[PDB]
Ligand SMILES: [Cl-]
């Protein structure tokens with residue numbers, strides 16, 4: 873298994889507040905140097921669709937790190953970041 877946080881609450885809050893969701897990932901080498909690799913920008917606004925997408929993603933990145941990102945669409949700056957999965 874992997875170490876995860878209870879990220880559904882943040883997904884829901886980001887969607888409800890109108891922030892754009894994206895993610896990024898890193899293996900141990902890239903985590904050690906903060907060189908995250910780009911993941912998807914999730915266009916759905918349906919909480920169930922976003923959560924299903926993130927679950928597939930976390931399964932693909934088992935053994936790696938994954939960071940959930942919220943962005944202000946207007947300012948294009950990050951309003952939220954959390955490492956939602958780490959190696960277990
Ligand atoms: Cl989605």
Ligand SMILES: [Co+2]
Pocket residue numbers: 877878882954
């Ligand atoms: Co949290």
